[PDB]
């Protein structure tokens, strides 16, 4: 009689929105977690709206729904693509158990109480290996808190060494000391804003910001260092002649492999514009001649 209740699990497991490859393979506790989280899921969905291979694939990050009590009630399938950890392994469980603990207070705050949220978290990654040997991975998380419940997208930032995607002419690349001082720049830099890298080698990046941006950026630098990666808000960089060009950068700390000491920041820089105020000269560097 145990025999069958056990087998009843199987029909249940199967007719979750999961393939039998991933439905069949379950100890029951899992099936519990899962059934319920699915329900709750459907519930708040109803609370919102008052063949789908493409959304999933088109994505570069995954969606998570989490209670205010931290329970990761929903998780995208393709999370495994990014985190390795497969949605079945996680749903129902507390976020904190899988997030870097120092980053948890931040987590706690964004969970609670403008309903808008944007922050970075380090989460366990196993891509592939097992969890004991699970290294941390930064997720840019962007979403909305609702009724308490947090709904987000978690976009891994990508690592400049290991490209998954093509670049275009309006993208250039730069290397910087921890100081943010340039150490390297590709010479699309020239094509794009006018500076020749030999000029900018000795220089802290800070000299090229338009000021309004500075603050927005400082936090970014800080986050770049506490977590090891960042995506900047959009900001203006001063072009070599007057005016500036809008920008967004993916900062990524690279370590010395033999040394495990950090070496520099690798910046994927995205130029969003042409020079806007050719007319206006802002800083002493644009003034020569």
């Amino acid at each position: 009689r145990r025999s069958k209740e056990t087998e009843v699990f199987y029909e249940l497991a199967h007719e979750l929105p999961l393939p039998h490859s991933v439905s069949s393979h379950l100890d029951k506790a899992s099936i519990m977690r899962l059934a319920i989280s699915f329900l709750r899921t459907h519930k708040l969905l109803s609370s919102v709206c008052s063949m789908d291979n493409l959304y999933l694939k088109a994505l570069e990050g995954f969606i998570a729904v989490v209670t205010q009590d931290g329970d990761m009630i929903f998780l995208s399938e393709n999370i495994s693509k990014f985190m390795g950890l497969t949605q079945v392994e996680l749903t129902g469980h507390s976020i904190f158990d899988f997030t870097h603990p120092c980053d948890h207070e931040e987590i706690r705050e964004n969970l609670t109480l403008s309903t808008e949220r944007d922050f970075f978290m380090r989460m366990k990654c196993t891509v592939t290996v097992n969890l004991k040997s699970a290294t941390w991975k930064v997720l840019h998380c962007t979403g909305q808190v609702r009724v308490s419940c947090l709904i987000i997208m978690c976009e891994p930032i990508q690592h400049p060494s290991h490209m998954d995607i093509p670049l275009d002419s309006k993208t250039f690349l730069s290397r910087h000391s921890m100081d943010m001082k340039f150490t390297y720049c590709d010479d699309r830099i020239l094509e794009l804003i006018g500076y020749h890298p030999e000029e900018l080698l000795g220089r802290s990046a800070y000299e090229f910001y338009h000021a309004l941006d500075s603050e927005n950026m400082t936090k970014s630098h800080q986050n770049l260092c506490t977590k090891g990666q960042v995506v900047s808000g959009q900001y203006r960089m001063l072009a070599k002649h007057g005016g500036y060009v809008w920008l967004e950068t993916q900062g990524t700390v690279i370590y010395n492999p033999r040394n495990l000491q950090p070496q520099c920041i690798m910046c994927v820089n995205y130029v969003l514009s042409e020079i806007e105020k050719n007319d206006v000269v802002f800083s002493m560097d644009q003034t020569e001649s």
Binding site: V8, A29, T142, A211, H221, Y270, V281, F282, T287
Partner: protein, 243 residues
């Protein structure tokens, strides 16, 4: 305690099934309930979290072979504007050649229209050739910046409106040269304390030599700026306000 929370599970499991809330049985009732029932909703889910919408375009003609309705909440744009269209039209003109390059997997940022444009992160991939992707939305006085010495290293454009000088004329020169001689030590010791007092703001007032050579009373409030890693301070930032 496996059992007690096994029964927690099964308890509120029971209670969200409406025609139920009103072991083996709770279970197969939930099952049939699934049978009665992650797709079009998923759309709204994106719209909520990412604030995004999906679209597909031919690689060659850049013609929108599909645009989700969520384009409208997202761009304040009808689908019709968009499915009769070629995407080169729906973006900022200076964004075009980038796109040619983007037209494996794809991702980029771009100004799309709602002459008013918005920043949009787009993530997708190529399938037959077309591109499946999602578009997402992520978001009196003047300001100066000085070296410790007092030299103008940065100036806001509106300087021209506030003091008559063009940026070129300020830049390079020590601020204390534009100061009324009387007030100069006032300015200097203000600066020293600004550095001694790292990061904190001090205000000071003084007559400023206008391009029309006029002593313009001005308060400025300012602070040294520490590097977030090293905490060493490279520049001072002033906001210099006409009084």
């Amino acid at each position: 305690r496996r059992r007690n929370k096994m029964t927690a599970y099964i308890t509120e499991l029971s209670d969200m099934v409406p025609t139920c809330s009103a072991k083996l049985t709770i279970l197969r009732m939930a099952v049939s309930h699934m049978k009665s029932l992650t797709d079009q909703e998923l759309k709204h889910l994106i719209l909520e979290a990412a604030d995004g919408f999906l679209f597909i375009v031919s690689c060659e003609t850049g013609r929108v072979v599909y645009v989700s309705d969520s384009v409208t909440p997202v761009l304040n744009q009808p689908q019709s504007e968009w499915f009769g269209s070629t995407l080169y039209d729906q973006v900022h003109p200076d964004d075009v050649d980038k796109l040619r390059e983007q037209l494996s997997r794809r991702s980029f940022i771009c100004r799309m229209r709602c002459p008013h444009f918005v920043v949009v992160h787009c993530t997708g991939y190529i399938k037959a050739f077309c591109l499946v992707a999602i578009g997402r939305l992520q978001v009196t006085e003047f300001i100066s910046r000085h070296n410790i010495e007092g030299i103008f290293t940065f100036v806001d454009h509106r300087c021209v409106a506030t003091v008559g000088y063009q940026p070129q004329e300020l830049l390079g020169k020590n601020i204390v040269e534009f100061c009324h001689p009387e007030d100069q030590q006032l300015l200097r010791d203000s600066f020293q304390q600004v550095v001694k007092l790292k990061g904190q703001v001090l205000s000071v007032m003084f007559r400023f030599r206008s391009k029309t050579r006029e002593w313009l009373w001005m308060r400025t409030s300012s602070f040294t700026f520490q590097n977030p890693y090293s905490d060493e301070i490279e520049y001072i930032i002033c906001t210099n306000t006409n009084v």
